[PDB]
Design a protein around this ligand. Structure first.
Ligand code: NI
Length: 341
């Protein structure tokens, strides 16, 4: 039974609520991004309207086989009317197609739902600048001061250098990046760019990238594993057993695998820095783990909310225990105190 924090009051609208069959008095179902915890339950047999970004639509059509008549893509940064309610979609800085949704209620209330996001200062020069926000539905994934991590740019720097270095030393070495959903594509395509390679992957994952409105994408990707010195494999498969077998599969074309595992936060973030990282080596294979987050750090989130100054905050992650909920409320109170609003 759809929880309260997936419902927008005084509309027929839910957000990311496809796993409760039909929802009591929902004219329109919004989807913030194409990640399975958020789209769970969508199928070819979905007959209610779905509102989403262009890229999330491409994905629903081609991957889930949702019928064209039910997919309502909207452009970003554009005032759109939907069932007599003004909405706007903002870039979320999460994965391809991911959006934040501004709802302008008939009664004059204004609601921001962030879906999944990584807050950034460039958001403060959007249509959010222009007016007051009464309720914030907040991605609270890393809402705790321990969670610091480096900028996406820093991590992609580290990844490129490690890749180039290892391949220049040994031009029979293969680079492997682990994946399970969209997002984290800048890791593997930035590596492939420096190397002068296309990225080799399965046909399923090849299809998925074809959905993403990437300029020139056909020059960048391939299924031909043999003509390709950066490869994508399921994250499940990024270990010595699964790497060995993969190195066996390439038919004597590579003597060495350098791999990256894009993990979110991990406890080693509290002690070690990004330039000071080391891999786990078992023979000719080396497996790095890098902290590429697609969610706000504690500080990023704090600064975003102190700038936005909402009247009320509703968390959408870590809400299932009273300890989590209790700890988050305290931090929100402190932020308000620190600022005065
Ligand atoms: Ni997500």
């Amino acid at each position: 039974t759809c929880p309260f924090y997936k419902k927008i009051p005084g509309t027929g609208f839910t957000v990311d609520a496809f796993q409760y069959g039909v929802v009591e008095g929902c004219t329109a179902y919004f989807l913030t991004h194409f990640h399975s915890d958020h789209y769970a339950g969508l199928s070819k047999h979905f007959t209610f309207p779905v509102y989403c970004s262009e890229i999330t639509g491409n994905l629903l059509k081609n991957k889930l086989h949702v019928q064209e008549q039910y997919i309502h893509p909207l452009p970003l940064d554009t005032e759109c009317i939907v069932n007599g309610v003004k909405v706007v979609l903002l870039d979320a800085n999460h994965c391809p197609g991911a959006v934040m949704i501004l709802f302008y209620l008939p009664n004059g209330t204004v609601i921001l739902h962030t879906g999944d996001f990584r807050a950034d200062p460039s958001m403060e020069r959007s249509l959010l600048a222009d007016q007051k926000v009464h309720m914030l539905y907040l991605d609270t994934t890393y809402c705790s001061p321990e969670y610091t991590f480096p900028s996406q740019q820093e991590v992609i720097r580290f990844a490129i250098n490690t890749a180039f270095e290892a391949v220049t030393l040994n031009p029979h070495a293969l680079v492997v990046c682990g994946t399970y959903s969209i997002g984290k594509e800048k890791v593997f395509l930035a590596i492939a760019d420096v190397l002068g390679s296309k990225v080799g992957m399965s046909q399923e994952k090849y299809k998925t990238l074809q959905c993403l409105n990437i300029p020139e994408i056909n020059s960048l990707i391939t299924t031909d594993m043999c003509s390709s010195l950066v490869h994508l494999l399921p994250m499940m498969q990024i270990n010595f057993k699964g790497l060995q077998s993969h190195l066996k599969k390439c038919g004597g074309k590579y003597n060495q695998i350098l791999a990256f595992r894009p993990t979110g936060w991990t406890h080693s973030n509290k002690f070690t820095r990004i330039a000071d990282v080391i891999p786990q080596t078992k023979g000719n294979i080396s497996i790095y783990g890098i902290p590429y987050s697609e969610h706000s750090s504690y500080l990023e989130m704090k600064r975003f909310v102190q700038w936005l100054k909402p009247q009320k905050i509703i968390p959408t992650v870590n809400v299932g225990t009273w300890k989590s909920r209790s700890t988050m409320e305290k931090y929100f109170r402190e932020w308000k105190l620190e600022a005065g609003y």
